[PDB]
Symmetry: C3
Subunit: 116 residues, 3 copies
């Protein structure tokens, strides 16, 4: 099992609250049902980005996961993650995209091998 | 509908025009047939990169879109995007890769939900 | 053909050895059997990341390739790449993920066209 979440945003680094990586780890572990040991997170502030031609605060994110991806699940993840970006980074949820990827275990490397 | 274009390059931030993200937004809106509101753009300069073993200017890019991806369309997008990168960032078109992704609406989160 | 490898890490830039990009290019050319001219590499240090809730050294990587991706092949790449990250960046192999992508030629743009 593995899942990784990346958020790219134009919000300044100083605006990312202390503990944000830990919150994302914890809340994604809950949402996906995976042990937090297997969750990786990456937050990239201060980016040169635009959404709909506006450079107001926005985010482009991805969640790659071995399983636990699907229509209803992804709706739930989007409510969780957009809520966090709004409440913690002050980004409007209508200025967030999250791309979701269901990875085959054979296509995820870890510890000198793969999960297959 | 949604599309997102990301360009990672070793060219310096000062060499990225201030209007580039808007230029990309408008040209991609035209190319995909989508209103510009649905187009997001992310440019990442000053990267540590090599292309073919050389660190002359280069770009690694991706275009993710809900639909409007396919053999012929992608041939056309490559001309558009190579043209823009050549003119505005001074990158030779033979030092550009663009990975194309046709996303299912169910796998694109936006505004606390997905597009499905 | 085409292949591209990206490594995102929290390790500082100063700890990435001189010659690291060239080592990645050459080792990936050997591993994939593709000429180095077709291989692009991208290293992104100093990132805000966590792996398993910890911000000890870690890496999130991806290898996109037209072909040369599969169960056994990916195991082999993971041993190679984790080995390099361990010896050169001092990152433990159990704090590395590598996502592997077999791209269709029609979905890889280069030089005003695609590979199809
Ligand atoms: C024949 C073309 C499509 C090709 O494979 C490439 C060529 C030619 C010169 C064989 N150079 N090159 C550099 C980076 C990526 C791809 C290529
Ligand atoms: Cl589901
Ligand atoms: Cl996969
Ligand atoms: Cl098409
Ligand atoms: Cl998809
Ligand atoms: Cl294989
Ligand atoms: Cl593909």
């Amino acid at each position: 099992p593995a899942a990784m979440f990346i958020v790219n945003t134009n919000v300044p680094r100083a605006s990312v609250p202390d503990g944000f990586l830990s919150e994302l780890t914890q809340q994604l572990a809950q949402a996906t049902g995976k042990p937090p040991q297997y969750i990786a997170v990456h937050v990239v502030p201060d980016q040169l980005m635009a959404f709909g031609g506006s450079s107001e605060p926005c985010a482009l994110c991805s969640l790659h996961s071995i399983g636990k991806i699907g229509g209803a699940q992804n709706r739930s993840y989007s409510k969780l993650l957009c809520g966090l970006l709004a409440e913690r980074l002050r980004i409007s949820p209508d200025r967030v995209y999250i791309n979701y990827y269901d990875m085959n275990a054979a296509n995820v490397g870890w510890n000198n091998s793969t999960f297959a």
